[PDB]
């Protein structure tokens, strides 16, 4: 459940998160 991988997601936010949702996350 939780446990869901630790290979998965390599860079932790899959990377493309920290990126993306940083991205659209204009915010601040």
């Given at each position: 459940?939780?446990?869901?991988?630790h290979?998965?997601?390599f860079e932790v936010r899959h990377q493309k998160l920290?990126?993306?949702?940083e991205d659209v996350g204009?915010?601040?």
């Open positions: 459940d939780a446990e869901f991988g290979d998965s997601g920290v990126f993306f949702a204009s915010n601040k």
